[PDB]
């Protein structure tokens, strides 16, 4: 086998909430660890275990509890979540030597849940100028107004997910104190853009509240959802 899986991958919590991050490995490794990555600190060890049934504290164990129920499971329990705990958490399993990692869990612990807002995604069309001189067409997608920045932007052409030619921002930028933005380019050939049968779609999967979760406001619950903007190729002359 080959796997270390974290869940949930994304999470929004309120100050004082209970959060449990899970990790399951199909490596039989005796060791498991929980780290948090933060700008200016790289990865810092929180807790770890040398074997099923036992827990050992890492360097910054305050605020977190760990629990290794069996060989392949290692959980981090933030009993009373605090804003300082919003971070990207990584789980790893290890056989005395090199560590095998998970994909990460994005966690936001808010003082006020009502700051959670989904994005508005806009699809800007290719410049005719660029098209004329370069025979290439850059479609740029722009998502804005989303508070948690737990999102993934994708491109779909004629129903199939596209990778060649795309370049989206590696990190969402904050455009206000509780609002983020993210962009992406999809450059195609003028020939391809000029075909009216070609259907372009910029998707942005937003991770927000769960159906369970209480929403303390008279507005739509900002639940997890996909939001898209699309366009079709245009003929020319």
């Amino acid at each position: 086998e080959a796997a270390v899986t974290q869940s949930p991958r994304n999470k929004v919590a309120v100050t004082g909430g209970k959060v449990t991050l899970s990790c399951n490995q199909t490596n039989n490794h005796n060791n498991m660890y929980w780290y948090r990555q933060d700008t200016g600190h790289g990865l810092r060890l929180i807790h770890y275990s040398y074997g099923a049934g036992s827990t050992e504290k890492g360097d910054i164990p305050d605020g977190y509890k760990a629990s290794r129920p069996s060989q392949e499971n290692f959980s981090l329990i933030l009993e009373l979540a605090t804003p300082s705990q919003t971070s990207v958490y990584f789980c790893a399993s290890g056989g005395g030597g090199t560590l095998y990692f998970g994909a990460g869990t994005r966690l936001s612990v808010l003082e006020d849940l009502r700051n959670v807002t989904p994005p508005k995604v806009s699809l800007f069309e290719p410049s005719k100028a660029e098209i004329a001189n370069k025979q290439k067409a850059t479609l740029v997608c722009l998502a804005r107004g989303f508070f948690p920045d737990h999102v993934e932007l994708s491109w779909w052409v004629n129903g199939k997910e596209v990778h060649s030619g795309v370049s989206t921002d590696p990190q969402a930028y904050k455009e206000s104190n509780y609002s983020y933005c993210l962009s992406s380019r999809l450059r195609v050939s003028a020939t391809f853009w000029h075909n009216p049968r070609n259907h372009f779609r910029c998707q942005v999967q937003f991770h927000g509240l769960s159906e369970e979760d209480k929403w303390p406001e008279g507005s739509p619950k900002p639940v997890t959802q996909n939001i898209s903007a699309e366009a079709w190729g245009r003929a020319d002359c």
């Binding site: 780290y35 990460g104 800007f124 005719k128 660029e130 004329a132 060649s164 370049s167 380019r185 450059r187």
Partner: protein
């Protein structure tokens, strides 16, 4: 118990060599590693050292030399390539000591744009009147993308996109503003060749 990476960022050109410095403070006979992180995934091990040969190799001629002598484990790559851009982390452990990581070093390798055509285009969002933004593209990897000044105006950081052709690498940055009438000519004032969306049928 302690690892130190002095440089948080290293910008190198494709073709040029790369060295990442790592200093460690461990009582014991430390174990030493170098992990790399591609954008938004976990860390993948790059190379490791436990005992014997002080010079360890990894994938792609990535070398790391150990020295109790002066407590370092510097990473080196003879010639770097665009795909090498990532965050490189150094780590130290030991018998019954969990891995300790450095703060990381983001390596930004600039590709060679053979024939660059700096142009700033104004794009439009049809399903929204007034909605427009500026696309700065095809510039050379050495030029510095202008920074924002005002509120209500934003300029992203350069990104490099690749198409499926031998050339097809292009630099780009995006800008937009909620202002009444500011053009792409002034927000990207420190650059070359502004092609305006004057449009022509033939």
């Amino acid at each position: 118990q302690s690892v130190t990476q002095p440089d948080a960022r290293v910008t190198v050109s494709e073709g040029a060599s790369l060295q990442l410095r790592c200093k460690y403070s461990y009582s014991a006979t430390p174990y030493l590693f170098w992990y790399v992180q591609y954008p938004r995934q976990g860390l993948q091990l790059l190379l490791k050292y436990y005992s014997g040969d002080p010079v360890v190799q990894g994938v792609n001629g990535f070398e790391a030399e150990f020295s109790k002598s002066n407590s370092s484990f510097h990473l080196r790559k003879a010639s770097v390539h665009w795909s090498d851009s990532a965050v490189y982390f150094c780590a130290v452990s030991g018998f019954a000591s969990a891995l300790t990581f450095g703060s990381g070093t983001k390596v930004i390798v600039l590709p060679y744009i053979q024939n660059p055509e700096p142009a700033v285009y104004a794009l439009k969002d049809p399903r929204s009147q007034d909605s427009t933004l500026c696309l700065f593209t095809d510039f050379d990897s050495q030029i510095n993308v202008p920074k924002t000044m005002e509120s209500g105006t934003f300029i992203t950081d350069a990104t490099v996109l690749d198409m499926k052709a031998m050339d097809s690498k292009s630099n780009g940055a995006i800008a937009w503003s909620n202002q009444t009438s500011f053009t792409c000519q002034d927000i990207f004032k420190e650059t070359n060749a502004t092609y305006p969306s004057s449009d022509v049928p033939c």
